[PDB]
Amino acid sequence: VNSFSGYLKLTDNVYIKNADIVEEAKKVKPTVVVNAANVYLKHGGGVAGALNKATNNAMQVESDDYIATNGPLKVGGSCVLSGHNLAKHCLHVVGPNVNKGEDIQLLKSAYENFNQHEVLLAPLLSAGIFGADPIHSLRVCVDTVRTNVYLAVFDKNLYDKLVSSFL
Ligand SMILES: O=C(O)Cc1n[nH]c(=O)c2ccccc12
């Protein structure tokens, strides 16, 4: 048993809810929240800017030190950093950004990072301002992630479409 509430079960291991991931993280304090990161860990908008804003910019300060030491992530890669006031850990995952011309095949590689964590709260990768089709992102998630993932869908309209089109 875990603390996640109100999710619709899609598969053995994937659950979905219409929710603000920031508000959900604050309520649950999950072991792992996933950020929709870029390779520079520049958290300006969408999930990264909303998560970062909720940490009062502490996520950005920590991220800038990580990049100064390690250099940028890979598209499809990840790093584990603090979850600050939102979670124990934040798994920063870089999905391909269609609005930068990145290979959508890298979306599967991105989701494979989730398999290193038994339970995660996460947004759809490469969705929103990263420009991918969220229906596709959900399919890749279901077909790639084997650990228990609780997906927070921001748009109620999109949530309803994801549910109603799910095979
Ligand atoms: O949650 C959603 O409704 C779609 C979605 N998935 N992932 C994102 O990163 C993102 C960012 C902004 C706006 C919507 C998104």
UniProtKB/Swiss-Prot annotation:
Inhibited in vitro by GRL-0617. Changing T31A: In strain: Mu/B.1.621. It is found in: Host endoplasmic reticulum membrane. Residues 1-167 form the Macro domain. It is a multi-pass membrane protein. It comes from the Viruses. It catalyses: Thiol-dependent hydrolysis of ester, thioester, amide, peptide and isopeptide bonds formed by the C-terminal Gly of ubiquitin (a 76-residue protein attached to proteins as an intracellular targeting signal). Responsible for the cleavages located at the N-terminus of the replicase polyprotein. Participates together with nsp4 in the assembly of virally-induced cytoplasmic double-membrane vesicles necessary for viral replication. Antagonizes innate immune induction of type I interferon by blocking the phosphorylation, dimerization and subsequent nuclear translocation of host IRF3. Also prevents host NF-kappa-B signaling. In addition, PL-PRO possesses a deubiquitinating/deISGylating activity and processes both 'Lys-48'- and 'Lys-63'-linked polyubiquitin chains from cellular substrates. May form homohexamers. Interacts with N protein. This is Papain-like protease nsp3.
